[PDB]
Amino acid sequence: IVEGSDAEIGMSPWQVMLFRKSPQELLCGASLISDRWVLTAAHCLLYPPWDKNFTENDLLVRIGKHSRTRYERNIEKISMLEKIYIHPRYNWRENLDRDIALMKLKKPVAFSDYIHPVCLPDRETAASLLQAGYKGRVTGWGNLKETGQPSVLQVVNLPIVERPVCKDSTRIRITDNMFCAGYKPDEGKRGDACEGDAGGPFVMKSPFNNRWYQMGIVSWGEGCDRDGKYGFYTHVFRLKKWIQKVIDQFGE
């Protein structure tokens, strides 16, 4: 995250970290939606142009963390992967549409004050909250600038942007399955998700039930915290039929 600030303990209990076994490296972020299902970006697990293509084996998910680094002794929980599920129609060559993947934990995690799950929106909340101007929460352990990493999980609140503006900032073929957020040039407030952030969540808090809903997945962009530019996120709502298909197919 660029232009954001230090999270607060237990402020993002569904914040999950996708970790590399060896080389032991952090590769992305993701969120917890049940005690055995984790959501992330497909490109976190499979992105050819990088010769990326991991298996439920090369990886580990670390749950309940604050430090980017310390082993948080009674506080974190290390988990193994059962199956990884990439969207049958996730396009990496062209626009990164349907940048989404589910991962089933070999074992269900035990909720705590630092571990608990975010909610996925229903039709109605999507219309309510997904409106140009409304703000979102994007948390990550990603870069502190386009071109380091924080000591602690970072948070930045940003507003959804209007379709046409999104389309006007980039040459990429923006689809119905993504959304854009960050400030406009004329608004003089910044912040954006940067590298090490995809998979991580874009959440909003309903004024109706006071629950956090996951409205997007940190996906992609041109640069980071660039005037005239917008962070792009996967439309969680939009791709729910599939999340739901694979879930009550392969777990729960």
Binding site: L96, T170, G196, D197, G223
Partner: peptide
Amino acid sequence: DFLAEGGGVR
């Protein structure tokens, strides 16, 4: 081309 048009996966 995400890459070609400058695409920055994160």
